[PDB]
Amino acid sequence: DRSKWHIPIPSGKNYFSFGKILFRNTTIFLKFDGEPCDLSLNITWYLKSADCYNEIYNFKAEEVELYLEKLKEKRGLSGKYQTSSKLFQNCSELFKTQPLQTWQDAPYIFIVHIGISSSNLFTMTVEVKGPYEYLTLEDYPLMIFFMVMCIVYVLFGVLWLAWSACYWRDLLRIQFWIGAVIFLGMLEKAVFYAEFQNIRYKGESVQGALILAELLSAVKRSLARTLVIIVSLGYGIVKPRLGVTLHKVVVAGALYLLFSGMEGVLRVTGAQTDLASLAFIPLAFLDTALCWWIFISLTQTMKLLKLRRNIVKLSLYRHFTNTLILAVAASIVFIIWTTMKFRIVTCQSDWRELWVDDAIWRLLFSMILFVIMVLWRPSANNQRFAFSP
Ligand SMILES: *[C@@H]1O[C@H](CO)[C@@H](O[C@@H]2O[C@H](CO)[C@@H](O[C@@H]3O[C@H](CO)[C@@H](O)[C@H](O)[C@@H]3O)[C@H](O)[C@H]2NC(C)=O)[C@H](O)[C@H]1NC(C)=O
Ligand SMILES: *[C@@H]1O[C@H](CO)[C@@H](O[C@@H]2O[C@H](CO)[C@@H](O)[C@H](O)[C@H]2NC(C)=O)[C@H](O)[C@H]1NC(C)=O
Ligand SMILES: *[C@@H]1O[C@H](CO)[C@@H](O[C@@H]2O[C@H](CO)[C@@H](O)[C@H](O)[C@H]2NC(C)=O)[C@H](O)[C@H]1NC(C)=O
Ligand SMILES: O=C(O)[C@H](O)[C@@H](O)[C@H](O)[C@H](O)CO
């Protein structure tokens, strides 16, 4: 996901190709540097538009040499293209013209080939610049989304801090970890925004910002799941804090984080080593099992509360269960819709809305967290949610 390319031309077949999605009226800059010239050069560049996104996704450089001829023979795909070629005696390195600008916003495939006629000799610098300095399309909406999420989490943290300050006299231990979750979200969104700003204004992504961000996301989700499990079991809320009730159970249930650590990082550093897609299923199955456990535990706790005729906590648990069930239903609907809208079409004819699959989950999590926070608002009578032996 870069925007600048440095390449030693005397390497392999010398073909340099890239498939991306660009804005409209975006220029491409080519520069050459190196040692003096003693031989003849031939340059040939092709720029092809895309009709539907599939070709970009499955574009393999290994067969470029064939793909080019596949475009010449007309058994490729529709879409107008611009081709050009030039000759240089020895170097003519101080060259101007190398028209070559985008005419319509859509997926693009760019290919450049160099033929030498008579060891590293030259070095090619390739840049792409649109209306924004280096922020190519497919990232602008994502950057806006991350900025908005940063603002929303800042507001959430401010509200939580104000509420805690206004009722600092007495607080609940379970009520403290909300602050930790908010802090983790703050760090995650800040890292996203900083990385995106750096990429836009420099053209190169951070060395390891994505890995740290994925680790933070996994940690936050694991903490949320463990807190939900503990609240559902009623540990410290309905039943007393028994010696070994979460011991070996709740903590032993944190291995979910590990499975999250083998998915987000992988997804980020896509390697496609036959394990990229496979890591997705087991995590979903584990989450389904966790929900299966949670609902049963929550039903048992509701029965126990009904037995002893407790009123205040009964309504709170009813609201909690309603919110959780609605969240689960919404998540299932969203997953089914994404699966039936993105991975069923012959080829994706709607390339605009592919960033939604990586943003909807965060928005849903933020909404659920906000609802949960609203449920547990600190107040003067902040002791009803205690065991009270
Ligand atoms: C290496 O590349 C350069 C640039 O493509 C070749 O051009 C050299 O630079 C001059 C500058 O114009 C070329 O024009 C010549 O100008 C002289 C007057 O100074 C004129 O009498 C010639 O008829 C010609 O128009 C010229 O072609 C050439 N000159 C020199 C001294 O190199 C250059 O030829 C290339 N060198 C090799 C070895 O291929
Ligand atoms: C395409 O983008 C370029 C660069 O953003 C535009 O170039 C500017 O055009 C306006 C009006 O045409 C000028 O006032 C500016 O001076 C130009 N920029 C520079 C750096 O000179 C261009 O107008 C856009 N449209 C087309 C059709 O090229
Ligand atoms: C520079 O490279 C291009 C790409 O191969 C050459 O274009 C071909 O050149 C010969 C001329 O007959 C044949 O392979 C084809 O007819 C050309 N392809 C076309 C016209 O699409 C080009 O000739 C090279 N420049 C030279 C040789 O000066
Ligand atoms: O992989 C993802 O994009 C998300 O982490 C989802 O898995 C949610 O966490 C979840 O399944 C609902 O709780």
Numbering used by the authors: 38 to 135, 173 to 192, 203 to 473
Paper text:
In this study, we identify and characterize the unique cation channel TMEM87A as a Golgi pH-regulating cation channel (GolpHCat), determine its atomic-level structure, delineate its ion conduction pathway, and ascertain its functions in Golgi homeostasis, protein glycosylation, and biological processes, and investigate its contribution to hippocampal spatial memory by employing multidisciplinary cutting-edge technologies, including Golgi-specific pH imaging, proteoliposome-single-channel recordings, cryo-EM structural analysis, molecular dynamic modeling, proteomics/glycomics approaches, and animal behavior tests. The structure of hTMEM87A contains two distinct domains: the globular domain [termed the extracellular/luminal domain (ELD), D38-K213] containing three glycans, N62, N79, and N127, and the transmembrane domain (TMD, Y224-P473) having seven transmembrane helices (7TM). Taken together, these structural analyses suggest that TMEM87A is a monomeric ion channel with a putative ion conduction pathway that can be opened by voltage stimulation and closed by PE. Taken together, these results suggest that TMEM87A might be a voltage- and pH-dependent, nonselective, and inwardly rectifying cation channel.
While we were substituting Cl− with various large anions, we serendipitously discovered that gluconate potently blocked TMEM87A-mediated currents with IC50 of 0.10 µM. Despite their robust cell membrane expression, current amplitudes at −150 mV were significantly decreased for all mutants compared to WT. Moreover, these residues in the constriction sites are highly conserved.
